[PDB]
Amino acid sequence: AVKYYTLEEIQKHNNSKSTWLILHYKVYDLTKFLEEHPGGEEVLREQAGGDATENFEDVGHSTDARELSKTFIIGELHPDDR
Ligand code: HEM
Numbered sequence: 001a002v003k004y005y006t007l008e009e010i011q012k013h014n015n016s017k018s019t020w021l022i023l024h025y026k027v028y029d030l031t032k033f034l035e036e037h038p039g040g041e042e043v044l045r046e047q048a049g050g051d052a053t054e055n056f057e058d059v060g061h062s063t064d065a066r067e068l069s070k071t072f073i074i075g076e077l078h079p080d081d082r
Contacts, residue, residue: 003075007050010077014049020074022051025082028072 005027013020019031021044034041039059047055061069 004078005075006078007081011049014045019044019048021047021049022077023053023056023069025077026073027075027077028069029074030072033072 010020010022010027013029017031018029019034020027020029022028030037030044034044037044043055
């Protein structure tokens with residue numbers, strides 16, 4: 001099965017308690033990763049609640065970084081919002 005979230009609900013996860021973002025139509029919960037991110041917290045909080053695919057690819061993350069990202073996936077963007 002697969003959980004689908006709308007842009008409207010993802011948008012609400014941009015506070016001190018929860019940080020979600022979209023990358024290639026998948027939704028990631030990065031709340032507990034903020035302090036471990038080599039690129040810092042600041043760059044993640046700025047994109048919280050929205051689609052950060054371009055910024056993510058613009059920095060050109062390594063293969064290991066991408067393999068690690070999969071552990072934070074909690075669902076996908078609802079087909080209707082794509
Ligand atoms: C989905 C979770 C993400 C993971 C698992 C992740 C992981 C990492 C890792 C391991 C690095 C070290 C370099 C590398 O291995 O490529 C890194 C660096 C970086 N990340 Fe991320 N990252 C994520 C999302 C993002 C996003 C969404 C942004 C941008 C909004 C971002 C911005 C950066 C920057 C600025 C650097 C440093 C690049 C430099 O040194 O020039 N990351 N990230």
